[PDB]
Amino acid sequence: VNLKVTIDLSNPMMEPGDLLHLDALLGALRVSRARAEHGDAINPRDYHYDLPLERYQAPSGDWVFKASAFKLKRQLPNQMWMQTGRLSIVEAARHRQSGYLQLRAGKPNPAGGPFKTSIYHRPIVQAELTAFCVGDQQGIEALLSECRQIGGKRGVGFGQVAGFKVEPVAETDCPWSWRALPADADPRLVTSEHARCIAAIRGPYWDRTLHVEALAPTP
Amino acid sequence: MQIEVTVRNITPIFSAAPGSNYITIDGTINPPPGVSRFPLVRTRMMYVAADVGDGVIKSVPLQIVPGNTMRSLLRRTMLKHVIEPALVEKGNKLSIGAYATAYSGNATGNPDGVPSSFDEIATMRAHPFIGLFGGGPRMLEGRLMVDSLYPIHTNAERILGAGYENEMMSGPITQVVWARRMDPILNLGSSEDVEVINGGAVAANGWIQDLLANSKAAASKKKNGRGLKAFNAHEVVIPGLKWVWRISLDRPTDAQVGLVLLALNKMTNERIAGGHSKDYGRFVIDGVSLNGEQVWSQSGITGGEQYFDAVAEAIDGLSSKEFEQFAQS
Amino acid sequence: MQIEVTVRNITPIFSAAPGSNYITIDGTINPPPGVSRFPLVRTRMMYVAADVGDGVIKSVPLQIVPGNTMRSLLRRTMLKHVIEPALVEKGNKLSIGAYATAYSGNATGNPDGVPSSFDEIATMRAHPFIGLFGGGPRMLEGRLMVDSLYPIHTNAERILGAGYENEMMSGPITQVVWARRMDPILNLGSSEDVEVINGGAVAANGWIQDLLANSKAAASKKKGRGLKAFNAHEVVIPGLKWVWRISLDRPTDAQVGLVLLALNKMTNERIAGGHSKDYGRFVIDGVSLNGEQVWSQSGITGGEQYFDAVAEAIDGLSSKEFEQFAQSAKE
Amino acid sequence: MRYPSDIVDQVLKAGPDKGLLTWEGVDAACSHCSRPIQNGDLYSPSSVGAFFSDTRDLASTSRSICWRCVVLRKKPMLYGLSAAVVTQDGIYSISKDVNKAWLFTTPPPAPFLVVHSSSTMQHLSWRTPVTLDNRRIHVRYGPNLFIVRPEVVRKALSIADRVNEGQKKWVTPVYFDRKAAAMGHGLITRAGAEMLTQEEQEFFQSVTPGERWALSYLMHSKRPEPEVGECITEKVMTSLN
DNA sequence: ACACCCTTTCATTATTAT
Numbered sequence A: 001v002n003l004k005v006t007i008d009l010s011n012p013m014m015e016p017g018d019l020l021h022l023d024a025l026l027g028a029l030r031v032s033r034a035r036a037e038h039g040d041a042i043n044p045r046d047y048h049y050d051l052p053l054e055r056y057q058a059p060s061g062d063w064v065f066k067a068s069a070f071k072l073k074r075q076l077p078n079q080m081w082m083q084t085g086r087l088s089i090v091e092a093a094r095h096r097q098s099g100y101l102q103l104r105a106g107k108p109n110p111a112g113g114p115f116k117t118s119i120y121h122r123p124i125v126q127a128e129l130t131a132f133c134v135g136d137q138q139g140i141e142a143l144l145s146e147c148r149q150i151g152g153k154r155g156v157g158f159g160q161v162a163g164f165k166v167e168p169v170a171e172t173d174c175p176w177s178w179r180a181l182p183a184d185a186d187p188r189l190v191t192s193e194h195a196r197c198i199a200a201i202r203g204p205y206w207d208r209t210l211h212v213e214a215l216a217p218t219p
Numbered sequence B: 001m002q003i004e005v006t007v008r009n010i011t012p013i014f015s016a017a018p019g020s021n022y023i024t025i026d027g028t029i030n031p032p033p034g035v036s037r038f039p040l041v042r043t044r045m046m047y048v049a050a051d052v053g054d055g056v057i058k059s060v061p062l063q064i065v066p067g068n069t070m071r072s073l074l075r076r077t078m079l080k081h082v083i084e085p086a087l088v089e090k091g092n093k094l095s096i097g098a099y100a101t102a103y104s105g106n107a108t109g110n111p112d113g114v115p116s117s118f119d120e121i122a123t124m125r126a127h128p129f130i131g132l133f134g135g136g137p138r139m140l141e142g143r144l145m146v147d148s149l150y151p152i153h154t155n156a157e158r159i160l161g162a163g164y165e166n167e168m169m170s171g172p173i174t175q176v177v178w179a180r181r182m183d184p185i186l187n188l189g190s191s192e193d194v195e196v197i198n199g200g201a202v203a204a205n206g207w208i209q210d211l212l213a214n215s216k217a218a219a220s221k222k223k224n225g226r227g228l229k230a231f232n233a234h235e236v237v238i239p240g241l242k243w244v245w246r247i248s249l250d251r252p253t254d255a256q257v258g259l260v261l262l263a264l265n266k267m268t269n270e271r272i273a274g275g276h277s278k279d280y281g282r283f284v285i286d287g288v289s290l291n292g293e294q295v296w297s298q299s300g301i302t303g304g305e306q307y308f309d310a311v312a313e314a315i316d317g318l319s320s321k322e323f324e325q326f327a328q329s
Numbered sequence C: 001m002q003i004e005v006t007v008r009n010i011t012p013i014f015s016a017a018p019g020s021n022y023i024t025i026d027g028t029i030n031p032p033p034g035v036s037r038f039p040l041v042r043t044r045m046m047y048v049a050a051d052v053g054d055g056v057i058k059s060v061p062l063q064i065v066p067g068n069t070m071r072s073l074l075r076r077t078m079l080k081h082v083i084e085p086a087l088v089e090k091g092n093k094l095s096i097g098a099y100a101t102a103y104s105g106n107a108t109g110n111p112d113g114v115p116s117s118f119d120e121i122a123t124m125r126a127h128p129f130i131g132l133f134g135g136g137p138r139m140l141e142g143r144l145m146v147d148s149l150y151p152i153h154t155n156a157e158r159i160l161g162a163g164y165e166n167e168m169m170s171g172p173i174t175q176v177v178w179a180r181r182m183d184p185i186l187n188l189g190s191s192e193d194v195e196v197i198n199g200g201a202v203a204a205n206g207w208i209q210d211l212l213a214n215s216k217a218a219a220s221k222k223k224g225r226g227l228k229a230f231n232a233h234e235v236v237i238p239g240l241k242w243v244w245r246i247s248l249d250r251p252t253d254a255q256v257g258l259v260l261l262a263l264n265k266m267t268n269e270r271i272a273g274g275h276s277k278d279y280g281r282f283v284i285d286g287v288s289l290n291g292e293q294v295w296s297q298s299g300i301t302g303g304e305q306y307f308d309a310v311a312e313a314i315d316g317l318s319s320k321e322f323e324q325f326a327q328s329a330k331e
Numbered sequence D: 001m002r003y004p005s006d007i008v009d010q011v012l013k014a015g016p017d018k019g020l021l022t023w024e025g026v027d028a029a030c031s032h033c034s035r036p037i038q039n040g041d042l043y044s045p046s047s048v049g050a051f052f053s054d055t056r057d058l059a060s061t062s063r064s065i066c067w068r069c070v071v072l073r074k075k076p077m078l079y080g081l082s083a084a085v086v087t088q089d090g091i092y093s094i095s096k097d098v099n100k101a102w103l104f105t106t107p108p109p110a111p112f113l114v115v116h117s118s119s120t121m122q123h124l125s126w127r128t129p130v131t132l133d134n135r136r137i138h139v140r141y142g143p144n145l146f147i148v149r150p151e152v153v154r155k156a157l158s159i160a161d162r163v164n165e166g167q168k169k170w171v172t173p174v175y176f177d178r179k180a181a182a183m184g185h186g187l188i189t190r191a192g193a194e195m196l197t198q199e200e201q202e203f204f205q206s207v208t209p210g211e212r213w214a215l216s217y218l219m220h221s222k223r224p225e226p227e228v229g230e231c232i233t234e235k236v237m238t239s240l241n
Numbered sequence E: 001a002c003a004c005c006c007t008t009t010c011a012t013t014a015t016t017a018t
């Protein structure tokens, strides 16, 4: 059907360090749908490839989904979210005195350990997310209608999806190739933005054990 | 499952921000160099998109409490008010890993990756507290999203959506509050004032002479011991305004919703985002819409009885060994 | 522990707001430049979202005393009246850094980033005074939270909630008060008046010629600073009913007893500032201890267990905890 | 050169410590290297102490550290690579800003590996992928992974040099934070807002946050000419041995 | 005897906008 999906989001999201693929989001949504039906005790890797998406086969194995990484049209200047992880030293001292916490150590350490006060700064963008793919319009729309947030750090409320629209587009108009592609991919599909890296082309894109020599663009 | 918590800050809100911010004696924030500037620590603000007065959207400064802060506040009020009293009632104790997992989501019990079977992932995700946040060595994804505390304000209108145009504040929601640290040795005035001090007058005069020596040293330096005289500023969010707070449970059990409901019941003692010595962050809960159904009364929550009963059967069935096997193995 | 006390200031409140504020001779606040403006030190104003009209909630001024000022007032009250009398009536004594830690929170600037021990933190938050005001070089979290002093006003209606709809003020709440600062030797009129001055008429006349030269220099500058300084300061009007929200996160019995003893010794203390003008004098007409009214005119007359606990704990008060609180791990 | 742990055998040559076990059964990837520990490969049970805070960047939950990552987790190899690029010939330092100018403009053509510390010492090297192509660099900085394009870096440098021709005082278009920690990291300055075209403002917004972090070390006033860092692989080999 | 805990210990730059 060769369609393009765009997403607008009320909350800003984490700016993705690597490529936010549409097939990754659809795989996580299908995994959540399978958890809704088949209970929480499922293998997520059984259903994360059960997508309304065509599959491109490289000449030597190495199939990828026909989706693309989300391109960002920035509505806002890029800002930075400071966040901290601090275990409450006062509450831990009270629990250690009362014996609810069984800690023999008398001194905390903010440099490292359980009481490491840690600071970390993640980039923030509010934008329009455009992804080009090859898939059935009806299947994607239901998955993205079950989608509430996009991007990372969704436990702290970031990147709440205000809405989305899924619309057909011409065959030469959409590049779905802006995507983590294998090294033996078709040179028609490979543009100047695609470069060699150690990256996942599929599935769990964070799984460093699944990273391959890939031709991927830059977010 | 969606929970909307509408709160009203009784005291100012101050979620401190990083960066070197400065302010003059007048309220000019970040003055250009070549003038007397003072250290300022502002509230947590992010730029958000808003369309007020025009169809297009512009980046406006919205002063919020982060979702990480409210997430840890929900976690800590469930621990302080439901989880730890129940565990003390059964007489159960927590280890270092179970405490750093339950109270901070930290993986310091097993820093090395801990493998969890999909079945035990399901059972711990069905736990009333563990499935809400996850964390620990397993890094379980929680059932719970805790959004940022958004002020009901025209800047937040894209985040708020419809249904909040009434009681919507406008303009600046912040104020620079000035705080100084007096040197109490300078306020010593009599022998009876100073005779609680070892040495008394001689030690007091030694402090005075050390302070004047440091002042002359700083004056000659301008043309590293810091004294107790300080004068600084902190931007707060003004009291009395209204905030929304989104808590979405991703396919929960009834006991997890009951635990969040017990948190909202006992949360009136807690404080939002710190500023602890100045009593900052004290609030009252004005409304709780449970999937859009208003459930908050003045005395806690009336109704929602299946969640309260499920969390009751959870907390009489709650022991620490679930937390130990969630942390260690 | 949610202490809500209500006071009545019988004398104006001057918590001086830092700024560069001016005023005309008529009383217009911060006039446009070019007109003759006098210096004005405004009282501490907060902004507050309030209900003006019907649901037209707006950030309006409400002039208050800061919670840092009221916190230090409570600290110095329980120090000068409870902690230090019980610490002098026995042989205990503090170092100058320990006095500095007990009053200003810290013994110096430049704190140590090394934290404190868990047993240390538990014992210090179990202390009657240190757990209320946890400062030190290693920064404790003191369990006392002190609110700002809010006037019971319609502009604080969202803050106060319910139970204050009577005895609530409205409209203007402040007043500009002017001060002259007249030169003393202009009042000199006779040789009997000048006999205390070295030289008598000679030094007085010399200061007069210096004043004339300074006035000529100031006129040349318009078209070294004298003793004539006419100025203004905005105060809060007296007779107001104010509220003050002490709170304590899971206190020891002795700590809230110490707060009750400081509130019972709040008589003849000044709230913020203007010492010479007696500003800040107040009468407490209410104390509520988790909502129950525990203030008579004679004193508290309630909450007895807190008072016995703080009596037994200032009986056991010593300087060792203060000294090991003030002791820097770096120093 | 396929995994980051290949900077232990191919470069900064070292062997196993020989107190390590031999892997048995089905193969599992290392928790740190992301390298598959095959049968007959030396491995350790994961004896990470409680001060190890990099569980989020662990590749697998196998609790099995490969010997190459045991060498990678050595403290001399930790602090010795607090600012380093590891090419196929040797390790070079990127502590100086001229060294980061050489790293991010005209980089070496090897499959190198860029590690940098946002703190005193962090478990830094094993969690970051190797940069096989020159034009896409995987930088590790503190707790975050970063992606830097050298050609876009030179384009931003050409714009920044062009907008300050003929001016006595060098004014930056956009503030970038070296710690990548300020809220204004990525916020364009008012001189840059009044000077740069909207296409160039969207260009400076369109770069990756790693490129913003890199440009922070190379948008300062005393503009760094790209100069190679001194080779430190002898230094960290001596510190390791 | 091994997990838990308390101290050294070592690495290198560098300017700053709002």
Ligand SMILES: [Zn+2]
Pocket (backbone or CB within 6 Å): D005, D029, D030, D031, D032, D033, D034, D035, D065, D066, D068, D069
């Ligand atoms: Zn490994």
